[PDB]
Write a protein that binds this ligand. Sequence first.
Ligand code: 4IT
Ligand code: 4IT
Lengths: 306, 306
Amino acid sequence: SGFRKMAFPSGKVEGCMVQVTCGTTTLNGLWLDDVVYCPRHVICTSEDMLNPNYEDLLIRKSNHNFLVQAGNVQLRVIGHSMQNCVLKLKVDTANPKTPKYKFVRIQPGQTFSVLACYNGSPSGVYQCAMRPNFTIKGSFLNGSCGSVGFNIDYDCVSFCYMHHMELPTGVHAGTDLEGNFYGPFVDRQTAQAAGTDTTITVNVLAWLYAAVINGDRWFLNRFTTTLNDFNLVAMKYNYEPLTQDHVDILGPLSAQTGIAVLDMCASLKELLQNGMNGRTILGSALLEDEFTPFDVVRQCSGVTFQ
Amino acid sequence: SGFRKMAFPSGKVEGCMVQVTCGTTTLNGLWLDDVVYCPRHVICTSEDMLNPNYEDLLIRKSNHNFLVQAGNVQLRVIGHSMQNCVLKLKVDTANPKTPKYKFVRIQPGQTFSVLACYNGSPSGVYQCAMRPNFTIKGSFLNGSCGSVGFNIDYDCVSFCYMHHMELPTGVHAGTDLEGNFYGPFVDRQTAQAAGTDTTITVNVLAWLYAAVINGDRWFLNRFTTTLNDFNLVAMKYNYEPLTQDHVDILGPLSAQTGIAVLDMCASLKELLQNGMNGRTILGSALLEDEFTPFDVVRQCSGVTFQ
Ligand SMILES: *C(=N)[C@H](C[C@@H]1CCNC1=O)NC(=O)[C@H](CC(C)C)NC(=O)c1cc2c(OC)cccc2[nH]1
Ligand SMILES: *C(=N)[C@H](C[C@@H]1CCNC1=O)NC(=O)[C@H](CC(C)C)NC(=O)c1cc2c(OC)cccc2[nH]1
């Protein structure tokens, strides 16, 4: 029993983090096989940062301008290339700890673990959601760039995120491991706006099912609703429209708890309209939206990895 | 910027988790050097837990009744002993992945990372506090006993917790790695009460300092108070009394934010008396008490380990 924001064990990723230095700037990179992946702004100087021409800054640099070290081991760089917003440095030695791995572009509302790193060394791990406006609510300081987010499916690490910037509002933005930003952001020292963020309805409902599985049941009611009528209440309170694909995803949970999806929608509707009344669900006074239905199912059925 | 409940990177601990089988029952153990540590109730049969005589169940068992598996490697058991509520299995081979480590008995209000495991393999990691009533608010299913809690200081893992039971109210209890329970709990299927749980006042203030560091400042006020006067407010509201030791520990944070401890107590008093008014602090509608002052400084100044 109990239910926590839980991250994936980070052993397989800690083994891949290295420090990458170019001139003054140091950040993190990801060492897999014979390639190190790192954010490309490692090649900026404190002036050229307000609008860099990265194709023309990469030209002033040769391999040996790139200092890569795994722990105290220095790696020899034997090639370098730019793909979108990441640099890829070919190194002489292939990471003996390379896990079996995939590169995956994640979808809004999906969750992943972040291993926050500084100077190539892990500091901590936490779970995160890719918000609908393509930001994440993380904990990142100077030097954190190159930190990666990931999921683990059995033995396979799915890398989905590399960290690149903090926006004005204090949320975070970054790329997939192909260097393509999530969202409309660019890697330049400019003030960029994220759009308005809705709440992930399908996740809030999966959390209500976790609550019920764990004994927390005061929010259950006698009522019902329809997908279209609840969706009017979702608009008003800034929740993503709920779809029949979402309904289908909540079904194994609906079928474990004996509570049909649309009656759980009805319980939610009434929490949105009247609030919680100073009570709590799974220890929270707010509606939590960073658990996918998969997360709820992993944590209530006990899925392992190694 | 940002602030999350972060766990320590779990790599050094994953290398130590193994499976321990005694008849029908399988749970987790901790392999360090040539010794495996696991909860002694691995030797109970599904009947005997209501009142076990552990010395007399442990006598019916020989080395070879204990099957240890580290991944797929079966370890040979060459000795066994009971120390308080933990079994110690002497195995022929020393764990090649043994980190530098100590066993530590932590104090109420200190935090630690939990690596939750099943069948000897890691499922996930989250951060936890030892409540004042010596329980923890975790996420543990059947098979999770033997999961351990730990802190990392640079290169040394400090093991502080091994998981043994869930109480009626759905909180959790366990031992230090010498097998002594935190709290008044015993390892038998009996009706056991956690005491009344107070809130960890020194941690709530540490979270308010974190909030201010990160821009959340709306709870700051013009008023002040005294140590004895706020403590009258802490009693009524179920908070542990604040001491000048606590003041002294909150001082480096008071000196980073330019806010003396007693002015921050004053902000808290009025949150306790008036609520939050539908607002949030660091994304929470509740007052968080599972960040120690140390945790706040680790996360706001970016401390690393590996
Ligand atoms: C990576 N090391 C760092 C991570 C930030 C540091 C502070 N918290 C983070 O998450 N990234 C950056 O510093 C990034 C570098 C560019 C060249 C890609 N810049 C920013 O992240 C940045 C610029 C900025 C402005 O205008 C300059 C205004 C508000 C916020 C902001 N953030
Ligand atoms: C260990 N593998 C397991 C962990 C539990 C499983 C369910 N959630 C957990 O945390 N421990 C036990 O099953 C433990 C066995 C020993 C201590 C004999 N028993 C309990 O944890 C337990 C007994 C109990 C009773 O019986 C009076 C009543 C309410 C709750 C409860 N929990």
